[PDB]
A paper describes a structure:
Upon activation by rapid exposure to low pH, homotrimeric ASIC1a channels open, exhibiting modest Na+ selectivity with PNa/PK ~ 7.8 and PNa/PCa ~ 18.5 and subsequently entering a long-lived desensitized state in hundreds of milliseconds. Chicken ASIC1, an ortholog of mammalian ASIC1a, is, from a structural standpoint, the most well-characterized member of the ENaC/DEG family of ion channels, with X-ray and single-particle cryo-EM structures of the detergent-solubilized channel determined in the resting, open and desensitized states.
While pH50 for cASIC1 is ~6.7 (29, 31), extensive 3D classification of the pH 7.0 dataset did not indicate the presence of either open or resting channels. At pH 7.0, cASIC1-SMA particles prepared at pH 7.0 populate a desensitized state that mirrors the overall architecture of the existing X-ray structure, including the presence of a proton-bound ‘collapsed’ acidic pocket. The pre-TM1 residues, from Val 17 to Leu 40, form a reentrant loop comprised of two short helical segments (Re-1 and Re-2) separated by a turn, positioned on the cytoplasmic side of the GAS belt. In our 2.8 Å reconstruction of a desensitized ASIC1, we observed multiple ordered elongated densities situated in hydrophobic channels along the TMD that we suggest may correspond to bound lipids. Separated into spatially distinct clusters, putative lipid densities reside near the top of the membrane sandwiched between TM2a and TM1 helices and near the cytoplasmic side of the membrane, between TM1 and TM2b. Furthermore, the size of the lower constriction formed by His 29 (radius ~2.1–2.6 Å) is unlikely to accommodate hydrated K+ ions, indicating a potential contribution to ion selectivity by a simple steric mechanism.
Residue numbers in the entry:
A (entry chain B), B (entry chain A), C (entry chain C): 17 to 462
The structure:
Amino acid sequence: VSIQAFASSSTLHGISHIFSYERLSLKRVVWALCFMGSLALLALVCTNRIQYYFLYPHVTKLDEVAATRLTFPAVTFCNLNEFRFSRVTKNDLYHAGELLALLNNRYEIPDTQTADEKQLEILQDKANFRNFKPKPFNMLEFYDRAGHDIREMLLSCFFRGEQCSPEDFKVVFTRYGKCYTFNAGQDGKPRLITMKGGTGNGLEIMLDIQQDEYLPVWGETDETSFEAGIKVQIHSQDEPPLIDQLGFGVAPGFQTFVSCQEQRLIYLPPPWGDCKATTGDSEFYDTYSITACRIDCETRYLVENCNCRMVHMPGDAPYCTPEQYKECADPALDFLVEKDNEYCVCEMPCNVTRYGKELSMVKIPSKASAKYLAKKYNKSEQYIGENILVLDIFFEALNYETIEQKKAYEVAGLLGDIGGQMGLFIGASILTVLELFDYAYEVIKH
Amino acid sequence: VSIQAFASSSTLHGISHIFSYERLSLKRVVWALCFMGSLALLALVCTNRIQYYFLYPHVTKLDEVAATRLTFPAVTFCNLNEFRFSRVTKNDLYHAGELLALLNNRYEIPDTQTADEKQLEILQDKANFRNFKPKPFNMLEFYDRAGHDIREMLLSCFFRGEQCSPEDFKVVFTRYGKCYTFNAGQDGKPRLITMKGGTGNGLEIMLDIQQDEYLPVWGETDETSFEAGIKVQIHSQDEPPLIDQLGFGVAPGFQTFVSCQEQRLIYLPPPWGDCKATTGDSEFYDTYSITACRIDCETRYLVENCNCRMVHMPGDAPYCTPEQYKECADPALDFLVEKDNEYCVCEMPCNVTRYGKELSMVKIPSKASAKYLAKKYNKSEQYIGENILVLDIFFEALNYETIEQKKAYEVAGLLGDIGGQMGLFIGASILTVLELFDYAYEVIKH
Amino acid sequence: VSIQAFASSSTLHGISHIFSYERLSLKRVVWALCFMGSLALLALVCTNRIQYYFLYPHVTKLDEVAATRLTFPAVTFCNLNEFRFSRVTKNDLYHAGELLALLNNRYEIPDTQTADEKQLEILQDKANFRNFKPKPFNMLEFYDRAGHDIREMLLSCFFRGEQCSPEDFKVVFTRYGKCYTFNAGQDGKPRLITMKGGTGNGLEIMLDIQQDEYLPVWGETDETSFEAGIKVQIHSQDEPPLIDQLGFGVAPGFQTFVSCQEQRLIYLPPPWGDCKATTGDSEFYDTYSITACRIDCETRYLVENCNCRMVHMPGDAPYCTPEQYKECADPALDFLVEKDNEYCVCEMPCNVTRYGKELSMVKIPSKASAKYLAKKYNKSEQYIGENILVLDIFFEALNYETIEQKKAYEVAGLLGDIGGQMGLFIGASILTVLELFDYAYEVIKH
Ligand SMILES: *[C@@H]1O[C@H](CO)[C@@H](O)[C@H](O)[C@H]1NC(C)=O
Ligand SMILES: *[C@@H]1O[C@H](CO)[C@@H](O)[C@H](O)[C@H]1NC(C)=O
Ligand SMILES: *[C@@H]1O[C@H](CO)[C@@H](O)[C@H](O)[C@H]1NC(C)=O
Ligand SMILES: *[C@@H]1O[C@H](CO)[C@@H](O)[C@H](O)[C@H]1NC(C)=O
Ligand SMILES: *[C@@H]1O[C@H](CO)[C@@H](O)[C@H](O)[C@H]1NC(C)=O
Ligand SMILES: *[C@@H]1O[C@H](CO)[C@@H](O)[C@H](O)[C@H]1NC(C)=O
């Protein structure tokens, strides 16, 4: 009933000395200030732990090991030329001549041409449209036919001692045209694995970029460039290539060693981080990713503005006219990748695989082996230094790395902190504060 | 009063069974050893948590995301030649001839010269000092005038589809001479941003290193080297370039793709780590950094030893004579960057921005576009393969990374551990040990 | 005795209101459900912390600083040729001619040879075995003698301003043959240190790959390749080189800048991670490592299958015949590094040092310094662009990095969580549950 009788039986550690059955003394002012000193200091450290919880903190866990049974990625490579010079016919020069800067606006050879005594004559008799009635023309058939063929570029391929074939590369269409992907993982083919590190457990491709098949550059367009070589992108199996933006280049006349390292990044869902479902809802792909978020940007943009998609874009929209490349599709796509700040926002998925790589080159051929490669492939010694290219893609020793975001402070650790801090200063529980509310309920009713 | 009366009311969980109102039995020896067993085991786990706190531990938090509105850094590039050959006059050869290894100690052409039939004759009639009365000469005017000009090297520049100009590069003086910085961020110009990854949201510079303007190398000095190309440093806006030590090189005749990734590093102050104030007190710079700590090393050293500063050093000290470069300033600066172990210690700041990069090259020009660039810039086809250089600097998809050091164990988590460990073994609080001191104060007074 | 008398004195916070000396009311059903509600909710958060402990979790600690007194690593480089052409004698061509694809199976020059009018005549009069009685022949003497000599390749070497010598490189035998290691750390030589970052605190080697000494390639073997240059491996002092698998290449005619960063990786022993003792038991090396685990794989494999070891393999097994290279040792070693999935498993050590590097190249020579290097080394201007090679290996500013795995949840933090969670919900200790077992022991005996 009385406060002296309640504080004797209660489970607060300090109140029994404050409300004892004695007179007022030096003790009752030094027990009360130690109790109110411990009650106020409890509120500072419990506010510190509750406000730390609702920030939802998280730390990282970076394992970097030498894993086995590691899946070899997909390697997409594109020749920097888009079309072979000997495959461009008279019908192809009629429709896509102004796009390739080979004709004027009046279907004739420009006066500012840069060609020798031979390639000018080959272009002058197939740009003769005296009795030319035009035939129909599609761009997808023209990238497929006039592009570079893998049965002529691929001189040798070895993956882990086993010889490749030109039927091991899958034809993919990018902005560079007819491109090829090793270890695409599609068409029912199983995926290839690597066990250890080094050049022996990797890919080795010897190519031929065929500079004699390059069509002459007479202007600055989006289909003719000033360079020679290939561009390579090493990406995951479930990710489409974005090789015009995210690819590295390989020069002819060199053997390029590409030492990779697979880095898997795992994030947290809200309220700790950001996660869209990685096997979520992309419009034309099964696995959501950053590059799959950017391709259906570009597909939705070009269909909205000029009613057509390019040949490297999915969907059922019609392909663009060769005039609609020059007028609509090239400046609208150049607006997205360069000057656009607002149209594309992409939510981060929480399975992102990154391949960090280190490139190095030696010179091919030496003076000793120059005459052997000229006879082996029926070529000249001037051809070999200009065109032959070897690419080595492999993993290092520490080939696997995981960067995982993990929760730093959970609800079971929150109750362990605020249960020890309640017990340290006053020694109470949640059944103590219900015993305080029981005496508060008794003092109102009487 | 009695110990049996005190232990009945006290809040230690074990002492009431030890001092009960009974005879000695098997219980009083098994309650006391469980209490002294829990009292001694409390001291082992509370010592483990207090000694863990005063080590001041910390863990890391590595976020690696694809950020937007990301600020494009500053790009400083220097041609590997210091002076153009057609800008060196007769007065310049008189004073700085022995420095450039073009004259002997008696102001005449050395007998061990390596020049052809034309560049030797051009040097023989401007090294004729028969009636030459010398004029005054400053080195800062000679790096500024005889250095390479950006209105002749810069053939084209594009940043995110927008064309650059030669007025977009800021003249900075380094040890290589007259150098240029894109996106310097100074002079009231706002800083440029990038949104996405890829080559379209980056910089593209086509240069001309001008090997016909290289002055001939006749010896091994600190101003003439054996190489050709440029050196580039990609640094932050608030950081001076140290391009002679920390720059990467770019070769002529190639298109170099530089795929970067911004990495921001945040550390902890003492007693957890090391922090000088990043906007602290550097002698000639506002933001403290590692390179700003090294330049005022080199400025304070050369003024102390030989009373002059070089042209790339701040302050109000006089510039060095061309003899004081050869005698004082070059071996004293070569002592600091190479053989010095004691003069410079730099406290680590805790905002360090690092740009990790991956380089790749294709060949420029191809055989198709060689004749077009020769006519476009009024040059020869031999000139284009030797001198033309294209540089692409861009960000990848995962372009942003934060490595932040965070405290692993604080004072609110320390009281939650030692408050639960006191409560687990004996069930006490800090008001329990004041109840023990109250009975100790009563037993002395009576 | 009674349950009302026991619950009044006990230290469970809720049981005294359940078993009071009153009648049944609304309170006895609301004290019991709050006690059994707090008793059941205690079991959910204590199971969450005990099951979290026995997963043995761990987080990481990534420090990335600019350390001083940092030890410079070992640099192993191998020329891509194995044997000099002018050192192959008539006895050497008799035994190891078919291995080098210079002879048929009947000891004569093949009809499909690729050589000019001079190197064919030099091979035709030393492949004349008309009166040739054969002499004995060992392969270790043939890699040592006919390999490339460092007193002819090394044109200059500087480490931190101090000039190297050819006696500073240690001869190591790899699969490429006679190879050399700078800063090997053996033979009583102290290890070299670096203080700051930049090219001045690093190594600078000017080489001569000697393409006039390359023996002609007439086929595809494991000792003759199509390339020219060197391969370099930057490894630790206590680690053998694996340069045929884990080395990067450097091309002639370029100055390669290699900007490194030392990364030290520390793991945890079981049950938290995986540790073999790093100074454990390798069969032929003192410090256990990944590459030392792979070399005694390859040594144990070849001795088991074809009774001999190659010249780059330790032990006391006999060296292989030049026929046993072609028949046994080359396809058995090509099976291990390429197609083997089961023979080698290597337990991870927990001191792994990794050197992450960034390569960049400028062109050597320029047109100005081409005639000087031709006269300095008594060579032609055609020789200098094909053969001269400069390599710069240095550290960056943030040259040191530590990735340490640290335990996230220990036994002293487990008792602090489950001691606060016991105290928060019921306010009990381990001396409370012994007071419950004391009343359970009393109710059985009476
Ligand atoms: C994401 O990765 C984790 C671990 O690699 C895996 O368990 C999970 O299934 C993945 N989610 C996907 C692929 O949607
Ligand atoms: C080899 O090349 C020549 C010239 O290109 C060609 O005429 C010939 O058909 C090719 N093939 C063979 C087997 O000679
Ligand atoms: C350091 O960085 C943090 C976060 O980037 C920022 O809040 C702080 O103002 C910076 N300190 C400086 C620039 O002195
Ligand atoms: C082009 O180059 C030549 C030779 O270098 C020069 O004489 C001429 O003035 C230049 N300009 C034009 C417009 O021809
Ligand atoms: C492993 O590294 C740690 C820290 O670098 C060191 O203390 C320990 O002695 C090392 N163990 C070895 C070399 O066996
Ligand atoms: C220089 O080279 C030539 C031709 O290789 C040689 O005959 C001569 O001995 C070499 N040395 C000197 C000092 O001329």
